């Protein structure tokens, strides 16, 4: 699945 806009910020 694709991921949240912010799935990657600390």
């Amino acid at each position, epitope marked *: *699945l*694709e*991921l*949240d*806009k*912010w*799935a990657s*910020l*600390w």
Partner: antibody, heavy 132, light 108 residues
């Protein structure tokens, strides 16, 4: 105090196009990372995520409803529109629009993801019924 | 897709008790879970964001916990208004999945 309010036709016929509007106050769609999302709820059932649009015109839709949903924004008029094409009696539900926070920004650059992980403020909801 | 499961699904309780609802994911969603309380004819209200963070305005009785795949909401002292349906939302993957709900009624 953030407030959102849904508006549109309470009655739509099948194969027609449903256009809902979300008018807000208390934030701007130009504030870093803010999002306005749509969630619906069939009478006496669960919440169902529909779509979301952000400050940067980045949009996402529910993969099931991908084909019919179109989400837009007018940053100036503080409004977000959701267009559901070719509706059927299964689309009869209460449609909510909600505000999503941007990340905790220090100097305009995000320092914390924390706050985005929830739709913090919702509107009263609008009941939409589909019938021929 | 994802699948985010709530257990109990329904629960009986009296004023004062303590209850814990469970939201479970098939994939790891890090800390991206939210908790809502829904009174009939009203929209969902935010209780817990980022799995454990209390939302400003939400009473201390509420509490969130967990990370990855196992999440829980813990109301400590049940109050009148707390008799409602509770939902959990996953905001890590698109689509932002919701739980099927966990209705909380008055026990007798």
């Amino acid at each position: 105090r953030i407030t959102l309010k849904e508006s549109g036709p309470p009655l739509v016929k099948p194969t027609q196009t449903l256009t809902l509007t979300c008018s807000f106050s208390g934030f701007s769609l130009s504030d870093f990372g803010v999002g306005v999302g749509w969630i619906r709820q069939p009478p006496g059932k669960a919440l169902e995520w529909l779509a979301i649009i952000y400050s940067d015109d980045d949009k996402r839709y529910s993969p099931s409803l991908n084909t019919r949903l179109t989400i837009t924004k007018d940053t100036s008029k503080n409004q977000v529109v959701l267009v559901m094409t070719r509706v059927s009696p299964v689309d009869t539900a209460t449609y909510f629009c909600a505000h999503r926070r941007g990340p905790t920004t220090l100097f305009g650059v995000p320092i914390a993801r924390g706050p985005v992980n929830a739709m913090d403020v919702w509107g009263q909801g609008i009941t939409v019924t589909i019938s021929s | 897709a994802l699948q985010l499961t709530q257990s109990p699904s329904s629960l009986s309780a009296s004023v004062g008790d303590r209850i814990t609802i469970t939201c479970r994911a098939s994939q790891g969603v890090t800390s991206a879970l939210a908790w809502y309380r829904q009174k009939p004819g009203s929209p969902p209200q935010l209780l817990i964001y980022d799995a454990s963070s209390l939302e400003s305005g939400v009473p201390s009785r509420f509490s969130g916990s967990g990370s990855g795949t196992e999440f829980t909401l813990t109301i400590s002292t049940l109050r009148p208004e707390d008799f409602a349906t509770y939902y959990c939302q996953q905001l890590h993957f698109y689509p932002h999945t919701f739980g099927g709900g966990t209705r909380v009624d008055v026990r007798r």
